[PDB]
Amino acid sequence: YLEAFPKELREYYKNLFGKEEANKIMKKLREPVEHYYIRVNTLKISREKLIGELKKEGLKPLRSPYLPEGLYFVREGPNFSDDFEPKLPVVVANKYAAESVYQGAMLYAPGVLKADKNIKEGDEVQIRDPKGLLVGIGIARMDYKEMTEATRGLAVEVTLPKFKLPSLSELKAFEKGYFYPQGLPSMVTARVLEPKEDDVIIDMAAAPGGKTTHIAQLLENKGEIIAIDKSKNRLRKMEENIKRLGVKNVKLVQMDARKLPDLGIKADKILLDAPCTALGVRPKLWEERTLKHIEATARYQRAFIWAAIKSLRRGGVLVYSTCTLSYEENEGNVKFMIRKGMKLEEQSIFIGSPGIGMNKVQRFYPHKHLTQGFFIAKLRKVKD
Ligand SMILES: C[S@@+](CC[C@H](N)C(=O)[O-])C[C@H]1O[C@@H](n2cnc3c(N)ncnc32)[C@H](O)[C@@H]1O
């Protein structure tokens, strides 16, 4: 599994976590989350009612004893060994199709990069990513010719994916806005912010609106939430999410959030779920980002942070989060905040790990918490 991670990043991990933990982290990072979480949209339905609805569809949701809006599904797999060499014609899926097949998705024609020419419908085939990673096995529903030419349709029915997570996007319950798939650490993030109906609230990197809409249901659609993003496409997806979830709480504004103080607002609560190297996301088939990205991104996040701090009222609260493991983007950027008049505060929910040489921040690790790698800091603005 170590091959998925560039050599200098591997050394970085070993240095930062210690060899043993680093090897455990990278090994687990290559796999999908063991517990696949979704958020109950309490704006439209209760947890237990939704459970009832999901059991109807043959799903086995489990309740979180920490998040009353939390449900999770247990992952299946691995369904074959890491060294398994099936005696099968190969279908090569592109980078994106391979990752979904890796988690139980079917393989559709546009997801096909190239294939063995002997493949005819009904043949048992193996599916590999462009770098030879075996991600799944299944039965071809197209001949080679149609497989490499079709623009739509089912190409391989994946009957033996490496791992299996439930597909929820096609459920009636999903279309009706009953839930929003979202990791446990992300749900913790919105809770730890503790939004009030009174608060002036800003989500300055909000799209597609996962944490924003969570705040909305915690507010029970009261108050107002200002949600900022630079990407129009992602904001467009956020608009759809808001409508589907029945969110009436949120004001969308498109802009570079680094210029946030250009508005005249001093917020009581700011969520900064910052763009990051995403070193913690799962599954991690091949990590492309490395050390140069950590430094560059860490510096890029500082602009957001400083923008937030200036836009906070004294006594105001900032919640900073990333889905990355690096020190520089996490504990290091919090030291920055401490030098800028912010103070660390106890988070209302702490089920992850302590930070690196740092006490009140919260880290999540895949091998310890069965989640994506994650980081959460909660700060109080004591002065300007
Ligand atoms: C980690 S994602 C945020 C996800 C969000 N917190 C959620 O729960 O769904 C980072 C987002 O920040 C946005 N972004 C990146 N640079 C930005 C900038 N300079 N100004 C405003 N938004 C930016 C990206 O469009 C991206 O959608």
Author numbering: 5 to 388
Anything the authors wrote about it?
In this study, we identified that PH1991 is a tRNA:m5C72 MTase NSun6 (PhNSun6). In contrast to hNSun6, which could only methylate four tRNAs with U73, PhNSun6 could catalyze m5C72 formation on eleven PhtRNAs harboring either U73 or G73. PhNSun6, with 12 α-helices and 19 β-strands, is divided into two distinct domains with different sizes: the MTase domain, including an RRM motif (residues 34–79 and residues 173–185) and a Rossmann-fold catalytic core (residues 185–389), and the PUA domain (residues 86–164). The tRNA substrates recognized by PhNSun6 were based on (i) the 3′ CCA terminus, (ii) the target site C72, (iii) U73 or G73, and (iv) the discriminatory base pair C2:G71 at the acceptor stem.
To better understand the recognition mechanism of PhNSun6, we solved the crystal structures of PhNSun6 in the apo form and in complex with SAM, sinefungin (an analog of SAM, SFG), and S-adenosyl-homocysteine (demethylated SAM, SAH). Cofactors bind at the Rossmann-fold catalytic core of PhNSun6. When comparing the structures of PhNSun6 in the apo form and in the form bound with cofactors, the overall structures do not show distinct changes, except that helix α9 moves a slightly toward the cofactors. Residues Met208, Ala209, Pro279, Phe308, Asp260, Asp233, Arg238, Ala211, Asp277, Lys215, Tyr304, Gly213 and Gly214 form the binding pocket for the cofactor SAH, as shown in Figure 5B. In the PhNSun6-SAM and PhNSun6-SFG complexes, similar binding models of the cofactors to that of SAH were observed, but are not discussed here. Although PhNSun6 contains a different RNA recognition motif compared with that in hNSun6, the main structure of PhNSun6 adopts a similar topology to hNSun6 and the two active Cys residues of PhNSun6 are conserved. The two conserved Cys residues point from opposite site sides of the cofactor, which is the same as that in hNSun6.
